[PDB]
Amino acid sequence: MDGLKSFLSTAPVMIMALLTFTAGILIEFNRFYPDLLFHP
Amino acid sequence: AALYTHHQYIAGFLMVGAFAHGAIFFVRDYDPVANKDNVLARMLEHKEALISHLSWVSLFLGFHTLGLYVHND
Amino acid sequence: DDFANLTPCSENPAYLAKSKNFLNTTNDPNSGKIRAERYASALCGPEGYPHLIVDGRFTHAGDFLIPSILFLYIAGWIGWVGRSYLIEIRESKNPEMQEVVINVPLAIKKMLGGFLWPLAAVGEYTSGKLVMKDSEIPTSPR
Amino acid sequence: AKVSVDNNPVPTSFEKWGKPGHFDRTLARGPKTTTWIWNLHANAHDFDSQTSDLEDVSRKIFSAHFGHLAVVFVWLSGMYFHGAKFSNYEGWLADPTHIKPSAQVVWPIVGQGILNGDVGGGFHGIQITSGLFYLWRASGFTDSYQLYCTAIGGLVMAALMLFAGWFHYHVKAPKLEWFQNVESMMNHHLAGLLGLGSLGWAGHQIHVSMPINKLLDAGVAPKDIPLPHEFILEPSKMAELYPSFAQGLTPFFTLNWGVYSDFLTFKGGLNPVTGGLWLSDTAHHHLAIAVLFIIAGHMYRTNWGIGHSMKEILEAHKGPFTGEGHKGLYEILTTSWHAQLAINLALLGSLTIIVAQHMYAMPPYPYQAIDYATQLSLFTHHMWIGGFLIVGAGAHGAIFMVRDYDPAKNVNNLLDRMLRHRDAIISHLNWVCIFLGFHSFGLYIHNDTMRALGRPQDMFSDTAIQLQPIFAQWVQHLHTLAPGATAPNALATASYAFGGETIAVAGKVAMMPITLGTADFMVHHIHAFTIHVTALILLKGVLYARSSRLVPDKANLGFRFPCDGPGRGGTCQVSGWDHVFLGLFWMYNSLSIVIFHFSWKMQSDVWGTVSPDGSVTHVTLGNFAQSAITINGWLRDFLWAQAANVINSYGSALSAYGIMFLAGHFVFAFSLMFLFSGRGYWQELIESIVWAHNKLNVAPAIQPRALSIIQGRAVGVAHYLLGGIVTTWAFFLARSLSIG
Amino acid sequence: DFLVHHAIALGLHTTALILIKGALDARGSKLMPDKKDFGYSFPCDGPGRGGTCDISAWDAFYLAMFWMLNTLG
Amino acid sequence: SHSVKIYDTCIGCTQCVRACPLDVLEMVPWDGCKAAQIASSPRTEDCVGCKRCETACPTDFLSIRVYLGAETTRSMGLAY
Amino acid sequence: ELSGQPPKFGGSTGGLLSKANREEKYAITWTSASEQVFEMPTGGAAIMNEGENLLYLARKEQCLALGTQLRTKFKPKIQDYKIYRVYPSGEVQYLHPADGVFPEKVNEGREAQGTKTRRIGQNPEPVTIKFSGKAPYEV
Amino acid sequence: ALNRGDKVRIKRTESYWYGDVGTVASVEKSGILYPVIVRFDRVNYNGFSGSASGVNTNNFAENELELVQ
Ligand code: CLA
Ligand code: CLA
Ligand code: CLA
Ligand code: CLA
Ligand code: CLA
Ligand SMILES: CCCCCCCCCCCCCCCC(=O)OC[C@H](COP(=O)(O)OC[C@@H](O)CO)OC(=O)CCCCCCCCCCCCCCC
Ligand SMILES: CC1=C(/C=C/C(C)=C/C=C/C(C)=C\C=C\C=C(C)\C=C\C=C(C)\C=C\C2=C[C@H](C)[C@H](O)CC2(C)C)C(C)(C)C[C@@H](O)C1
Ligand SMILES: CC1=C(/C=C/C(C)=C/C=C/C(C)=C/C=C/C=C(C)/C=C/C=C(C)/C=C/C2=C(C)CCCC2(C)C)C(C)(C)CCC1
Ligand SMILES: CC1=C(C/C=C(\C)CCC[C@H](C)CCC[C@H](C)CCCC(C)C)C(=O)c2ccccc2C1=O
Ligand code: SF4
Ligand code: SF4
């Protein structure tokens, strides 16, 4: 529905979706490659 | 330790008072027409740039210092 | 002879003594050993922890320079896409409504075009419409 | 039938989801400044201001209450699921005295797997302090499958609550006359909810909880104990455990109730095996209150002319000093939701305060008294809940006074008389607050100065000038003698706090007599001072919300306004909302002192380890009596001494608490940005920053604005309370988990 | 010492920001174009036009005293 | 007592007079605006300084300004 | 001089103080078309009687608040109230409305007061008027 | 000189839109000393504490406006 699409596109939903995307990226990277103090 | 703390606190109080009484001067004793286009007037011209870059440097120091301290903690 | 007070971690007795008992950060059982290996090439202090040297030297470029370039690229990407989206929506009829309800199509279109942000920024500066003139900006009374 | 509804009043559509701010006329137009955002999140659930029709407001309230019920159901189902899948409840059940409860497991990602400490039995996880394990053991839980089924049922109930809200608003909305059947509502909610709930719980306990707990306390392994339905299916086991069950239900209908004495006792005290209350005592208790509540029902006239009328009772109780008496209150409490909210919030907050103060003295759950962390956590948590609810009562009462109070319907009634001698009330209350604070806190400061000057014989202590609480000692003596003398059929005292023997389980003191001395006198009167001051602030907010000698028209200005202006010398913080904002801090202060007193007294005079000989060694020894009389004693022997376990928590499983401790100390300080400053400075700073962003042609369309004065105060108080409470929470949890 | 010296730098720049913005905005700003007519120290300009609440330069000094104390600490 | 001044940018919307709770302001005939009326402050000794008139003024900057000055019993708005 | 039956009130602690007999008080009088309940500015509700009324208050702001309530919160709008200042000696000074016409609407014969012939941005700089007992708005 | 639809820059030096640009909504032809009416996209600070909007219209004299269009 158009109203549902408009609600999903509001500021809090976008900000939280982007934050979870970034957090998932960082968490997965830190899981598969932890303890990166510098480019060795 | 007592002497260092005492004279440093005195210095801080005096440094605050200098700016306070300078603001008092700007309120009371500043004549825009007499000090026209000179350095004193030029200060009030790019004051927005002054405050903006000062805010940027304060935020830049605070964010990345608190981040380092909290990261270490 | 630089950093006479900082010794390599590969020989610092404190670092070698403390690297045996490195805790496992992840569920991998040998993450601590990997961390000890990776940190054995750094410059440890008397207490055995790595120290980062930031003075411009390229021998320690991994401490600051590479993360600096990475962060600068990412931050420029974010700022450029945000500014472009703002300027784009500013010509519409309800710029404020599109500020709270994000135009996801246009938003993503600007999202994907931000990897060339340095070239776009330099072209913007040369075109002269990156920076407004001082006489075209509202200012507070002096 | 008194049911009256309207069919499909509001269509179910998604369009209004795409237009935030639709409820408000001032916000649905579209944002021009950032304030439009903050208003949107602030005026959302204020249905009274949105529309003038009372019926629509009542419908919205009904469905919103359905929504909160659904949320609470989801929370309960989540608790049960996380106790069923990620907990050592089955392990703890076999060895309750050697395994710490734990129901939260932490993923190892960035080293937070260190939080998964060793809780005993080979299980690694975060120790819980809610006491859910003891409640589940008392309820008869023995397997994780039952907990999983409970979680599934909770999720189903949450979905049903959501559907109920949708149906009873968007489809079949009740009429106003339906909501105002206060007699019918009170009857159904006293007899059908409290009485029936108590009867059902008594039935569950008698037919499920007592047999399982009796077998568990004897020494039977959890897996050997029969499943709860097998007791009902084969009553032979029930008759074996309790002989009177062989008699069946015949004595109940013939009033030969005494035969049921074996499983319906009046023992009183604590169960030696578990340290909790006897389940037979609880069974007769909940049965008795069920009978009492069902009898308390059938009291108000609903449909058959047989019953009392609330309006008649209210208008009949009037006297010489009170003019019209309780006249017009029925119309107040049947036309304004805010007055009902105020009364219910005050009573409920006091109720949770009573719960906190009574659940620790007579611990109802098995193995709860010996788990000091759970005791402290439960006490402090429900204490804070009660304080917040009381402050909310003080707020929403002033809201009612500003909005729903009408002088036409209140002439010479109790409300008007209250509004007439309000100056006398406030003046006398202010005097009593000053007197209490002066004399009590001056006893404290006087003791501090006497100790600092090397004259301990001039202090206010048990060795020095006594100041003994003779009345509290007398009532403790009376309650200690009550079994046999004034309650002949009781076997032991209501609790061992008043007096008696020392009940200790697993070499840990569960409950021993709590002696009151000079320090207890001082702290109790300090509590009285703080409570009277908070009451003074909230009462001044409620009474003076309409007007005052300074501003005679505050009612027209609204309930939430920052000031009237810099005139009249300055009129800052005159609204009722400002009185709530000021009372929040004093509630925090009073409750902090209360929880500090509870923690220190519990650690110093009750909790501890009992030797095989019988000697009791307390957690902090007997230092409360000789240290809690000076502020320096409170600072050194309580904060500095007991904060060691939270400052030395780094590198261990408790490290998170330590982190959170510092977190609190941060946010509190952060709040001082908003409380100490004003919005013009921030507005000018935002002007400069807006010039900066404008120079690069990146200025936002939604013009940024500094927070409003009211918003600034609200943000300051919120972050302040959050920081302080988080600090206290981390400190208490670390200390209580580090004292065995 | 590196971290604490950079924290001190943050404190100095923030206190300077507060004092300097007060001194420069003492004459007037967008919220109060005619602040000089009201003197150096006045309470506010009422709840209107947004709220004012410490728009005077004396209030800037009062706010900067806290940051001076924190930096000295 | 406080001072109240009305400048020539007034448009004669009379909002300031309506907003005044102590009846300090008045509407007098004028010619500088379309409404041909301007605000006045004859009874300025009763002003308390609540700035409601300033809040009510819709001009780009307040055509009515209140400067707080000497404080009397009336200015403090005292009932005792 | 001042006539009118006082409204029926039970008495409250929010009323007058020694200032009334020491400095001054204020009186408000109005004609009511029906005996009906209104709200005291000092706290409480009192009934006002058919015909003349007379009420003594401590501040002019309270009197004008009562006048606003009379004008707004009653369908038979009461537009005839009069506010006087009563001195301890006995002098009564007519305060509101000044000329009998409400200040909200413009009436001829009034005199402009406090009106400046310039705009707010044209005020003189303080430095040009310092060491004199004047302020930029005073000039 | 200034007509409808004219984009003008404000030089009142104390208004909220000093240096900003607005459009001429109307001009009144009489002895009025601030006859030009200019409306702006942005709104000023006008309003009580907590209001969600300001004022986007004002009156100016002819001499304090610079034509841009
Ligand atoms: C040589 C130093 C010096 C001199 C000559 C002045 C002179 C002046 N200042 Mg200035 N000032 C100074 C240093 C100085 N200041 C410093 C260092 C600061 C920063 C703290 C300030 C901050 C300042 C402000 C913010 C203001 C002035 C103002 C003024 C003017 C008059 C008002 C005044 O201060 O009197 C009145 C002073 C007081 C009433 C001081 C009361 C405070 C007391 C002394 C504190 C006592 C503490 C207490 C007793 C502790 C007890 C401890 C016990 C419990 C053990 C005057 C021109 C005011 C102005 O605008 O006038 C033009 C004004 O607003 N000054
Ligand atoms: C510990 C308390 C504390 C903190 C953290 C700050 C922080 C700040 N103050 Mg401040 N202030 C404080 C107390 C504090 N103040 C007190 C008590 C006063 C006296 C009234 C003042 C008076 C004051 C003035 C007068 C001014 C400041 C300014 C500033 C900013 C300067 C930038 C900076 O230092 O680093 C950068 C900022 C930070 C490091 C803070 C951000 C910290 C968080 C954790 C970052 C992440 C946000 C987080 C994700 C949000 C999640 C929320 C979610 C959970 C709901 C900054 C926001 C100045 C300013 O605005 O500069 C532009 C300024 O003009 N403050
Ligand atoms: C009060 C309720 C409550 C709370 C606080 C928790 C808390 C927790 N649960 Mg839990 N749980 C609950 C109820 C609750 N549960 C219920 C009712 C069930 C039964 C269905 C479960 C079943 C459950 C399982 C099966 C597991 C947990 C786990 C966990 C832990 C990890 C957190 C997590 O799952 O995030 C994980 C991270 C995310 C969920 C982030 C994903 C992105 C989110 C959803 C963003 C939301 C927006 C998204 C984009 C979708 C858009 C929606 C939009 C249209 C509105 C955490 C302690 C885990 C655990 O403890 O493992 C050891 C685990 O495995 N829970
Ligand atoms: C026996 C009849 C009965 C019962 C049990 C209730 C119970 C309740 N009413 Mg209620 N009510 C009744 C009759 C009843 N009402 C009548 C006759 C009227 C009209 C005069 C109202 C009008 C009314 C209003 C206007 C409101 C309530 C509300 C509530 C809830 C308050 C929240 C609470 O107590 O948390 C405790 C919560 C629980 C114990 C969870 C109970 C979950 C369901 C709904 C209970 C169903 C029980 C049912 C008998 C089936 C169980 C039998 C068997 C399966 C074991 C509560 C669930 C409030 C609300 O919105 O809540 C929805 C509210 O505002 N009532
Ligand atoms: C049964 C409980 C109950 C109910 C139904 C209401 C209902 C209402 N209240 Mg009330 N109130 C209550 C309890 C309750 N209150 C209590 C206990 C207090 C004391 C604190 C108050 C104090 C209060 C005030 C001061 C005001 C209301 C107002 C209102 C009205 C709606 C506006 C509102 O608050 O929504 C909007 C709600 C919010 C914006 C809350 C969001 C911000 C919260 C505080 C953050 C909480 C953070 C959380 C605790 C931790 C998060 C940590 C983070 C890191 C994630 C409405 C009639 C307002 C009114 O005037 O209505 C007429 C109003 O001004 N209430
Ligand atoms: C127990 C020892 C420790 C506590 C001691 C403190 C007691 C202090 C005062 C004595 C209580 C007297 C109540 C009689 C008073 C009484 O019963 O009044 C009843 C009386 C109403 O009489 P009527 O019969 O007219 O009332 C009809 C009613 O039914 C209304 O419809 O009310 C008044 O006269 C006005 C009340 C004045 C109240 C004065 C305020 C007192 C505030 C302080 C009270 C503090 C108690 C705190 C501790 C609880
Ligand atoms: C283009 C763009 C924008 C705008 C950008 C603008 C307008 C930028 C303007 C910048 C200005 C005006 C000035 C900048 C000055 C920069 C300086 C002075 C840099 C100094 C660097 C130094 C001193 C380097 C120091 C060492 C260098 C060395 C490599 C080691 O580390 C050691 C160490 C730290 C000592 C935004 C913000 C709008 C959006 C962005 O996405 C893109
Ligand atoms: C290193 C070295 C050196 C060098 C040095 C130097 C170079 C220094 C400098 C220094 C500096 C360079 C300093 C500065 C400082 C400053 C400050 C401290 C400032 C302050 C200011 C203020 C306070 C302000 C105020 C005011 C105002 C605002 C307005 C009016 C006026 C006035 C002024 C009042 C040498 C060679 C010798 C030797 C070797 C070593
Ligand atoms: C700092 C400060 C400001 C400025 C602060 C502002 C403008 C608030 C800025 C908030 C930012 C934009 C967001 C931070 C809070 C959000 C809730 C964070 C949301 C995070 C999720 C998206 C993850 C005031 O306006 C103010 C007003 C009155 C008294 C004191 C003060 C005051 O102290
Ligand atoms: S300081 Fe703020 S709250 Fe106080 S009177 Fe002025 S504007 Fe109102
Ligand atoms: S509110 Fe302003 S514009 Fe309107 S009449 Fe009063 S002074 Fe003139």
Numbering used by the authors:
A (entry chain j): 1 to 40
B (entry chain b): 367 to 439
C (entry chain f): 24 to 165
D (entry chain a): 12 to 751
E (entry chain b): 513 to 585
F (entry chain c): 2 to 81
G (entry chain d): 3 to 141
H (entry chain e): 2 to 70
Kindly provide excerpts from the paper associated with this entry.
The highly conserved Ycf48 assembly factor binds to the newly synthesized D1 reaction center polypeptide and promotes the initial steps of PSII assembly, but its binding site is unclear. Here we use cryo-electron microscopy to determine the structure of a cyanobacterial PSII D1/D2 reaction center assembly complex with Ycf48 attached.
Additionally, all the particles were pooled to generate a consensus PSI map at 2.9 Å. SDS-PAGE analysis coupled to immunoblotting and mass spectrometry confirmed that the isolated complex contained the PsaA, PsaB, PsaC, PsaD, PsaE, PsaF, PsaL, PsaK1 and PsaK2 subunits of PSI, the PSII subunits D1, D2, PsbI, PsbE and PsbF of Cyt b-559 plus the Ycf48 accessory factor. Other regions that could not be modelled in the RCII/PSI complex include the N- and C-terminal regions of PSII subunits and the N-terminal region of PsaK1 and the C-terminal tail of PsaL. A peculiar feature of the RCII/PSI complex is the opposite membrane orientation of RCII and PSI in comparison with the standard PSI and PSII complexes embedded in the thylakoid membrane.
